[PDB]
Amino acid sequence: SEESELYHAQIHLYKHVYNFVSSMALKSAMELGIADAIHNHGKPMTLSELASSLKLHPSKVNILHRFLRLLTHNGFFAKTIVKGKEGDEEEEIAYSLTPPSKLLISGKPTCLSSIVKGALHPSSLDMWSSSKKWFNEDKEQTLFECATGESFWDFLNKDSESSTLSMFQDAMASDSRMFKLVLQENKRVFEGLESLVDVGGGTGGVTKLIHEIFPHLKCTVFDQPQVVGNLTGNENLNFVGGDMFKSIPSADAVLLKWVLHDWNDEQSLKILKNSKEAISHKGKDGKVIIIDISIDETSDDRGLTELQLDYDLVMLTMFLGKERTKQEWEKLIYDAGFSSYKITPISGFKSLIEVYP
């Protein structure tokens, strides 16, 4: 027969069709403030208690229940049994948070809420209804532009989209501070360093975070003359204006945070070569630190690769941008003259790459 494969095949097909539902359910849990509700309660919450805290109309309680059932199954909540109140009520299910949902508790350094809201915002999703036309047109543009008629950036700067613009900014600011946790969780990367040059460090926001964890590290914020201006620092902070394609101030290490993903291979190679020279004096002790995405298709964590590819598609459909695979990074690294490198997964699906001369 071999056609009896139909079932095993349908299952796989349907699971991918209805996956979107799990995202919408996560979106709902964060917009309803369920995490904060449970967190503020202080202990497992029952349906009714949660419903009361959310101030739901009675008819919306069973809806809350349904979403909860799915979210619980997806690991965003844990079910517990708690006896009712005053004899009559028997036993009730109580919901507790899990590591994933704790990332939804507002007012905390770990809150990824703004990113969940932004990633699943209509401005992120609605454009897909234009996907077929987008594939079949002759104009080269983002899916967002194809569906909207304008670039995402322009759309955001509209006055009628001010709130959306804030939301997006909240997502970035959140993505930026998430880097502090990256430093805290990977001190080993910076421990033996006496100096570090932050390429494209702009006005020093990133270096400031670096100093919040490594205050003795001599950091140099390197960027264009016009961006760094006359900016001054202190004993362990200085600003240098130049062109990274010509040279990079020397230091024990070169940090390239979200810098190379905006450049093609040719331009990225130059930057990496100037980075190797920037650490040459330190010999084999120097290192270059790259912070960008790295997709490893051979990884055994298929789910992670899928997530990385998923994000890659978002970059594609919204900005026509791209993320590199582990292999593309390896080629740049070796073509640049480096000897070895080490990839450390950070922030759920991003990467921290240590490159050695």
Ligand X SMILES: Oc1ccc2c(c1)OC[C@]1(O)c3cc4c(cc3O[C@H]21)OCO4
| Distance, CA of 224 to CA of 147 (rounded, Å) | 36
Restricting to residues 302-331, name those near its own copies by CB under 8 A. 302-307, 309-314, 316
213 makes contact with ligand X (CB under 6 A): no
Does the annotation flag 257 for ligand binding? yes
Instruction: Estimate to the nearest angstrom the gap between the alpha carbon of 140 and the chain centroid.
Output: 27
Decide if 261 is catalytic: yes
Q: Interacting stretch for its own copies, rule CB under 8 A, among 130-138, 188-196, 256-264, 332-340?
A: 130-138
| Distance, CA of 268 to CA of 272 (rounded, Å) | 6
Restricting to residues 172-191, name those near ligand X by CB under 6 A. 172, 175
Does the annotation flag 337 for ligand binding? no
Does the annotation flag 200 for ligand binding? yes
List, as one string, the DSSP characters of 300-312.
S-HHHHHHHHHHH
Restricting to residues 226-265, name those near ligand SAH by CB under 6 A. 227, 243-245, 257-259
Least distance (Å) from ligand X to the CB of residue 114? Answer: 8
| Distance, CA of 341 to CA of 346 (rounded, Å) | 16
Closest CB to its own copies among residues 225, 348: 348
Closest listed residue to residue 174, CA positions, set 115, 229, 224, 233? 115
| Distance, CA of 9 to CA of 5 (rounded, Å) | 6
Taking CB within 5 to 8 Å according to partner kind, which of ligand SAH, ligand X, its own copies, none is near residue 283? none
Type of residue found at 313: L
Instruction: Please write down the long-range contacts of 226-234, taking CB distance under 8 Å and 24 or more positions apart.
Output: 227/202, 227/203, 228/203, 231/203, 231/204, 233/204
**Which listed residue (168, 338, 341, 349) binds ligand X by CB under 6 A?**
168
Closest CB to its own copies among residues 262, 285: 262
167 makes contact with ligand X (CB under 6 A): yes
Q: Kindly state the number of chain residues that form the binding site for its own copies, as judged by CB under 8 A.
A: 89
60 makes contact with its own copies (CB under 8 A): yes
| Distance, CA of 44 to CA of 93 (rounded, Å) | 9
Least distance (Å) from ligand SAH to the CB of residue 257? Answer: 4
Which sequence positions are flagged as catalytic?
261
Residue list for the binding site for S-adenosyl-L-methionine = 199-202, 223-224, 243-244, 257
